[PDB]
Amino acid sequence: GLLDGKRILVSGIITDSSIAFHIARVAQEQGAQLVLTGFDRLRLIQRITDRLPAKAPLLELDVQNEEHLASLAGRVTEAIGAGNKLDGVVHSIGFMPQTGMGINPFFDAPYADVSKGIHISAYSYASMAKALLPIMNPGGSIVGMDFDPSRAMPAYNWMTVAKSALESVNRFVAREAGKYGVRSNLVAAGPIRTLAMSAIVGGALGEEAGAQIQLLEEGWDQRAPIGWNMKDATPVAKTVCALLSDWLPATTGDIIYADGGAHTQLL
Amino acid sequence: GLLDGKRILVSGIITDSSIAFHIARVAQEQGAQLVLTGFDRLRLIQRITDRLPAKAPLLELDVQNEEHLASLAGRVTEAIGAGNKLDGVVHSIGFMPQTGMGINPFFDAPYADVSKGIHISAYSYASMAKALLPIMNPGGSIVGMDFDPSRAMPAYNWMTVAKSALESVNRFVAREAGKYGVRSNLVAAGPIRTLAMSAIVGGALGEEAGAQIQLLEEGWDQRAPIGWNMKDATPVAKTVCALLSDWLPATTGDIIYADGGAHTQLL
Amino acid sequence: GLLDGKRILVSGIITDSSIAFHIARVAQEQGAQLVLTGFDRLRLIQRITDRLPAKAPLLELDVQNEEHLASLAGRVTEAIGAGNKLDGVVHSIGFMPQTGMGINPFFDAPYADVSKGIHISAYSYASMAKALLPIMNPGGSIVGMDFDPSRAMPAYNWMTVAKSALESVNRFVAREAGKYGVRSNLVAAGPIRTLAMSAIVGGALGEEAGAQIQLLEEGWDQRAPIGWNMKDATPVAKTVCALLSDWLPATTGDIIYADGGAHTQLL
């Protein structure tokens, strides 16, 4: 197994189409022992993660809750056993209020909404690293999820801004994590048909926003030299496991693109 | 004059070493008629701007104040006369609480502090565009100030993250401004010895943070193929005026580097 | 005039749709005194440049001819008068044999053809700087023409590779030019309907290559927040003059995008 013997925390499962669900499944297939964290609907999340190939302890973590973060390391150590540390951490968390995405005009998003989205989607990457680095082994790996924000696009709006912030946060987290012998990187994935994404294409955030996201998805597969299957998160999950493994040992502060090569092609 | 007949709003003057003070001076030398905006210390700012080559109306603008922003367009129109519109807008505004910069550990900045810094330094670029685009002429220009955040560095810490967000905001503001025939761009300047910068090098944010910023400044002049004079903001001011003029008419959503060429050289 | 009193060499005119023809016209409108260089068809080029607003001496320059390059500085000094130096140099030169572009498979371009294209399109930027820097004034400006090669695209093929090389060459030319007080930069233009470009869209390099270039042009105007008019080279010419002026005095080794903002937008 690629991750045999490694102890890895995976955040961000909410449904069986969550990117983090497939990260967790592939990691377990590769021998990793997992600790899961979930937000708000913990009964639902437990029922979802019962379908993973192996049982895993589930801990509550709202990344806006300073008490959850202050206790997180101790709860993880209780789950994996005293004297054991984590080898990996997966941040697979995002949120932006509806005013910050969709046909809702970019200029009409109130800052309270934008600030909440940047808190959950970018600042919390630093929050989780702060909480967990003291219980991570040298040679460890922190990985977060990205959507390439280097160019503007329709509908993503303030979530794009939050991803630009996250990429910057990742480069500073790498500075801190390096003191522990730990790497920090992001995986920039192409579009994946999660439940939230399927709802947006169906028009949950306005019709023309849904139309624009559908055109974005089509252009992605067209641009990708090896194609892009938005219905299959496994290539993204394998890329996250590659970063969690010992096989990218000199990469940190960086972004790995699991997007079919689409960002390397103009058309 | 490069800006003869143009009506341009300039924010961000606080002392005579403010980058915006030199933007305003050069713009007036080139024939522009200015409206100035200032924050908090308006008595001080009026006394500072009395030294500009021409008189200019001074309006109060705290970019965190929704009432200031909601009234801004009407107060500008009163200042320049009904039936007149702006040709240019300069955003030269930044702030990050001390916990977000310096020797203060990156992980120890509370989100309330970071969110305030991102509000003032990044979100407000969209706020000012929202307020002022309805009173801007086609062919107009919005310019904001940037410090290249594409790589992490010592001490800049969460202000770097705010600049990463600002660059993303600029690309979305360009989308909105294009509907008005208006361009939006940032000038990424090299380090300039403002009062705040001089204080930081003197150790106001911790000794080793000051030591690191001094080493950053020295490397900048070394890297720049034409050199870099941190005591001279005029090259930055001229670059802002170039973007405010009609001579970069096909550039928008973009970043112009007024840094001596330092970002193009590794060493 | 933006360029009043400046002495500027402009290469690359071959027809009245040449980007360099419009660079020269705008520069003369702004008070510059020009020296022109032309390749192979000097009778044709003289007849074309007779239509510029002012007379200008025309010198022969094949950038693959070491004798033309070794004599160029002396011929320029003869044209502008002893004791006079150049303030500006415009490189607006490109060529790639047909095997290196179009439907002709990327793998089938022989290296002899590719090497000729890289010689004319990239190496010659260093050749011209070597020849002309000894007769350039401090504060001078060298500008070359670019087409953004950061992503692959259909048909451009090995010309894309040549532009990637040119961007690298520009950063090294900036190092050398800085010793003379001279800046070096590229303007990355959007697509312009030159005679060669019109022929390619008409299918001169294969039908599907023409189809792909037409789709590229359409997407460009769609992406550009201020639009893009491929029939109008004046915005590109003005951007070149901006770099030749004193108004971007701290930019070197760099690329200015005169593309409507298209490269800042995904769709």
Added chain:
Amino acid sequence: GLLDGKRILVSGIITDSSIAFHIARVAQEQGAQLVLTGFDRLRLIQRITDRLPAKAPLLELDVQNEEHLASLAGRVTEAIGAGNKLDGVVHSIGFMPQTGMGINPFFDAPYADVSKGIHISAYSYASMAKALLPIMNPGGSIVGMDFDPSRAMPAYNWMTVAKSALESVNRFVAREAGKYGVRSNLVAAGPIRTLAMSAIVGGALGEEAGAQIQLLEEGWDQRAPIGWNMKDATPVAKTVCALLSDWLPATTGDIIYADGGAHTQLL
């Protein structure tokens, strides 16, 4: 083994400090069956590769020799057996005449020398892909070696330009390779003390060029959040094997940085 059962061609071994020697060693440790290619000194190369953990057939390949390239696929098939195809190809080849590197002035490199360096270092990546893609399996991987050329630097000079060209070539090779189900990527490594590199630091290309390269190496380890050991090529070799494996299945046309994170940090 990470590469169990895979058949992989590895070019570029010349001494036991060659990056390709360590790529080959790690690949064999991970279960790959290798075919090696070598240039000019095949007796020497055979003696060097006798020290690899497993025997491997050695084929002659001068990438400037069209006859070597036209016969390469048939010689590989003979070596691995009819009906067998390659799963991986490693391009680890570079050369630039001395006039193109070191204290030798950038402007003094003759184009014949530069063209030879671009032939060997960049064009040959397309040449090898053209020769070998017809005998590669779907799911295969082509990997080449890069040194980040996005900024100019002392001494690397025209080799930097060749790497800029190589990055562009890689994006076009990805387009062709995708038709075969094959990925193409580069690994941008930090500095490694090969025999050639040790000689350059010792002054083989001029004293100040050696001084500048030594300062470059020191800054690299300083910048890298996890450090950088120029005496240890194993982290680079493991990264190449990661790309040769099935664990980065949605990455193509891309660059993976095995540099300690140095390129993500300003200082």
